[PDB]
Design a protein around this nucleic acid. Structure first.
Lengths: 50, 194, 129, 100, 84, 150, 91, 155
RNA sequence: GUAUGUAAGCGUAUUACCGGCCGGUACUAUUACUUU
């Protein structure tokens, strides 16, 4: 019982670590992708031309 | 989008002028877009200026997970800052807070009553470590004077010391006001393997 | 191994000055040694000391004027209840005028002269004349 | 000389897969699961030669043990007197193609 | 002299003569190299006191065989005595 | 020291001063971390990982590239062996030489040295019980030891 | 209990037949009744049936041996010696 | 423990719970008043919740724990409602100009309010009304009982 | 002109009130030692 309840907290805290890391990982991909997108779309087409 | 002020400058102080100006400088660098993705996460909590007897050194304060990322680029960031912000030697420390083994009236360290790390001198050694980025102090030899004064010889490597060797003199002041103990610089001039 | 590190360094200093040699390599240099050595500086007994940062335990190079007859280290660090300060100074110091007995006191590693001014006794580290 | 197999058998136990003992070893010999068959020096005369012949027809390689049953079994780390082994899938081994 | 210092600035030639542990700040004589076996474009940074019987990337060719001070780098191998 | 013998002879690791370097090293902390997992799954002990990776790669020091030493990395991913590797090896040698003595009894030098190999295990294990990395009242006995190695 | 430190098995003979004789008995009565490793089954199931005959309980391979000991000291030397002369005559 | 099942019915002097005639009820089911150990010494809350009779307990008993406050280490937890502590200290003998490390081993009453009392616990003991020959003390605080790692339960 | 030893500042344990820096209150790692 003690080991099962001490699994219950740390496994959900490991889920919580994954939740923090998912939010950080999505906002890493998302913030760079949209920000990069605003700068880039007209300029990338021009570079290919050159 | 418009990363100016009130974005990269806080978490410390919502003003001032020095902080805001160097914030504008960073944004200029970001425009180059190879620079952009790496640089943007790097937040400045505060900036202070001090003077070594003519010219002022701009010390930067770093939140510390940012520090590892800051370190890799660092020399390119510093060089570009030096030309834009000229006459300033730009130096990086990361803001570490200074904790006590029992100060006072039968009294406490508490908050988190202190692993090895959470104290004084780990910070101090990090202060030498961040100010000198590419050389690294091969020996550090600390003089005590006859008229009860303590003075540190800090011995710089020689490799890529070229960016910090003019800044040797200013490092003395950067140390003196913030950390304190008076520092002098020694090399070994040439790479003599044992 | 080296149970008291203090004595090993200060013996090295004695042996060095017995040649006349102005320099010594000290191993493996403690905080207690650093505080012992700063205490020396004040009275001019030794010239400048320098602690090199090996990532191991710190070595020291000593520069020596040669003003020092001999430096001894007290272990066990006998509890001085302020009025044994007088007894200990008489025995091992050559004169009542001169020569410092060194303590680990509450407020720091200090000489018995300094300890008397603060009125803080201690445990005895050492003797320097 | 030898050394040799005490080091080898520990690796097979850890990574791979085992069947010990006449009934399972014969089953693995029949089924073709048995890449290697190891026979004790002790095994009652009949069963040395059976297990060789199941192996000969199978074309599987027989390793003849330098030691006892207790020696076989201590090598596998099992407290039991092993008089035959089949090594059925050893995952780190150069041991698959070996003859003592 | 028997007053004969200057170990704070310890003279070049002597330090070289002594040993790897007998320096003021005891610094490794254990360097780095990059090894090129010419059938392979691949550089793997191997040590002269090797610590590995070093297989290159796929090819189990050899590279070096240890002898208890400096590992003998074997035959037709070229190396740069530098951290790349 | 050398507590078993009179031997003064110290030969130990000279660590290069530069705590962050090497600068030439293209490879990420993730890259080195990944290889530590793979080799550890292959059954390599942290010592064997630490030497192999230096030569094959460049991994100058595992500690310098990724802030965590091999054993720490392995533990976080759960590859940690039940008894720390240094005990495992000592325990392997004690079993091996005990098995030798059952075969070749009357090796008076071997039995004497058999005591030294058990004596060091008990002392080294005593420290680990203090760390609580070994469950308190963990004991080295010969019966169990034989099984333990294999 | 380690009931008797000194006598072990020779406590059957208790007080009778003088201590020095009883020490000799202790070694021999240990070696007999003892389970030996059968070379032909690898199991330690060999026990003394009668004076010179040791039967392995399992495989039923019954081996001729020394009266108190499976292998008498003479025998080991004997068997190695003949074996070595065998090698030189053949090639 | 035991359901206070001894040959006698265990009752505290002066508390009989009065069902019949006196103004009704707000829950708790118990007329148990409990202590403030007060040399700033905080009560364990099991005193207030304690079914346990213990007349030799300051929490459930008519006893003062009177006098000398000493801190020591439990050497033996073996006894039902008492423990042994060894205290080890330096006594400086001027003559030998060094000490002797010297011990006093003293039995001290553990009220069964105090739970997970195990050797080696640091325990604050007070001299008590002298309770049964070698037991001349009672525990005022178990300052350890402890497990600086164990307070928050390991996975 | 020094000297800084003494005093006050500034950098996660001198923080927070009430009454006019003071003095309480709220206060806080165990010891051995040592101080009064």
């Amino acid at each position: 019982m003690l080991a099962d309840q001490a699994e219950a907290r740390r496994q959900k805290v490991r889920e919580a670590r994954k939740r923090r890391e998912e939010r950080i990982a999505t906002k890493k991909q998302e913030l760079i992708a949209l920000h990069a997108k605003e700068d880039e779309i007209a300029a990338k087409a021009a570079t290919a031309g050159h | 989008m418009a990363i100016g002020s009130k974005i990269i400058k806080p978490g410390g102080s919502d003003p001032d002028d020095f902080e805001k100006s160097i914030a504008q400088a960073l944004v200029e660098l970001e425009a180059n877009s190879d620079l952009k993705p790496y640089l943007r996460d790097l937040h400045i909590t505060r900036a202070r200026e001090i003077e070594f007897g003519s010219k002022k050194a701009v010390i930067i304060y770093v939140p510390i997970p940012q520090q590892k990322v800051f370190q890799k680029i660092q020399i390119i960031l510093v060089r570009e800052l030096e030309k834009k912000f000229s006459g300033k030697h730009v130096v990086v420390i990361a803001e570490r807070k200074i904790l006590p083994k029992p100060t006072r009236k039968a009294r406490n360290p508490l908050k988190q009553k202190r692993p090895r790390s959470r104290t004084l001198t780990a910070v101090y050694d990090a202060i030498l470590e961040d100010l000198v980025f590419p050389a690294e102090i091969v020996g550090k030899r600390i003089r005590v004077k006859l008229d009860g004064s303590q003075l540190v010889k800090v011995h710089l490597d020689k490799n890529q010391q070229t960016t910090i060797e003019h800044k040797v003199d200013t490092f003395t002041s950067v140390y003196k006001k913030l950390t304190g103990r008076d520092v002098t610089f020694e090399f070994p001039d040439n790479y003599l393997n044992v | 191994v080296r149970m008291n590190v203090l004595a090993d360094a200060l013996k090295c200093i004695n042996n060095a000055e017995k040649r006349g040699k102005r320099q010594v390599l000290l191993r493996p240099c403690s905080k207690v040694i650093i505080k012992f050595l700063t205490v020396m500086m004040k009275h001019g007994y030794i010239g400048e000391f320098e602690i090199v940062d090996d990532h191991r335990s710190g070595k020291i190079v000593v520069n020596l004027t040669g003003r020092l007859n001999k430096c001894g280290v007290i272990s066990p660090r006998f509890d001085v209840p302020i009025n044994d300060i007088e007894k200990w100074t008489n025995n091992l110091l050559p004169s009542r005028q001169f020569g410092y007995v060194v303590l680990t006191t509450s407020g720091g590693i200090m000489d018995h002269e300094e300890a008397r001014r603060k009125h803080l006794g201690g445990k005895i580290l050492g003797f320097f004349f | 000389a030898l050394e040799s197999t005490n080091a080898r058998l520990a690796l097979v136990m850890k990574s791979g897969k085992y069947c010990l003992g006449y009934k399972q070893t014969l089953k693995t010999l029949r089924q073709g699961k048995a890449k290697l068959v190891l026979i004790a020096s002790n095994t009652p005369a009949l069963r040395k030669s059976e297990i060789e012949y199941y192996a000969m027809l199978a074309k599987t390689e027989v390793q003849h043990y330098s030691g006892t049953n207790i020696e076989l079994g201590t090598a596998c780390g099992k407290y039991f007197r092993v008089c035959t082994l089949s090594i059925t899938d050893p995952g780190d081994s150069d041991i698959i193609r070996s003859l003592e | 002299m028997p007053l004969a210092k200057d170990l704070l600035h310890p003279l070049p030639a002597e330090e070289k003569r002594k040993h790897k542990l007998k320096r003021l700040v005891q610094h490794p004589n254990s360097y780095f190299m990059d090894v090129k076996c010419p059938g392979c474009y691949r550089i793997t940074t191997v040590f002269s006191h090797a610590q590995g019987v070093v297989v290159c990337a796929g090819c189990a060719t050899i590279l070096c065989q240890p002898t208890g001070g400096r590992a003998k780098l074997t035959e037709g191998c070229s190396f740069r005595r530098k951290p790349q | 020291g050398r507590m078993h013998a009179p031997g003064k002879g110290i030969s130990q690791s000279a660590l290069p001063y530069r705590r962050t370097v090497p600068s030439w090293l293209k490879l990420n902390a993730d890259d080195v971390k990944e290889q530590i997992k793979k080799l550890g799954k292959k059954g390599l002990t942290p010592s064997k990982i630490g030497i192999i990776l230096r030569d094959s790669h460049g991994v100058a020091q595992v500690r310098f590239v990724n802030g965590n030493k091999i054993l720490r990395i392995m533990k976080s991913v759960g590859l940690k062996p039940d008894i720390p590797e240094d005990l495992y090896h000592m325990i392997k040698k004690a079993v091996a030489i005990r098995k030798h003595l059952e075969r070749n009894r009357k090796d008076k030098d071997g039995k004497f040295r058999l005591i030294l190999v058990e004596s060091r295990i008990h002392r080294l294990a005593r420290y680990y019980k203090t760390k609580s990395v070994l469950p308190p009242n963990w004991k080295y006995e010969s019966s169990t030891a034989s099984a333990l190695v294999a | 209990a380690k009931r008797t430190k000194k006598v072990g098995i020779v406590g059957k003979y208790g007080t009778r037949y003088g201590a020095s004789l009883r020490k000799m008995v202790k070694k021999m009565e240990i070696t007999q009744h003892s389970k030996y490793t059968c070379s032909f089954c690898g199991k330690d199931s060999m026990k003394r049936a009668v004076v010179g005959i040791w039967s392995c309980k399992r495989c039923k391979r019954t081996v001729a041996g020394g009266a108190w000991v499976y292998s008498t000291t003479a025998a080991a030397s004997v068997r190695s010696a003949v074996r070595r002369l065998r090698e030189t005559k053949e090639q | 423990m035991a359901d206070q099942n001894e040959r006698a019915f265990q009752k505290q002097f002066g508390v009989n719970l009065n069902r019949k005639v006196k103004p009704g009820i707000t829950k708790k089911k118990l007329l148990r008043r409990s202590r403030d150990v007060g040399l700033g010494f905080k009560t364990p809350r099991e005193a207030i919740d304690g079914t346990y009779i213990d007349k030799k307990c300051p929490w459930t008993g008519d006893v003062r724990i009177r006098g000398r406050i000493l801190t020591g280490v439990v050497r033996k937890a073996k006894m039902q409602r008492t423990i042994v502590i060894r205290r080890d200290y330096l006594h400086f003998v001027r003559k030998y100009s060094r000490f002797e490390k010297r011990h006093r081993n003293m039995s001290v009453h553990c009220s069964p309010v105090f739970r997970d009392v195990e050797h080696g616990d640091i325990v604050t003991i007070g001299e008590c009304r002298p309770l049964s020959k070698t037991v001349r003390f009672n525990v005022l605080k178990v300052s350890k009982g402890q497990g600086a790692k164990k307070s928050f339960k390991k996975y």
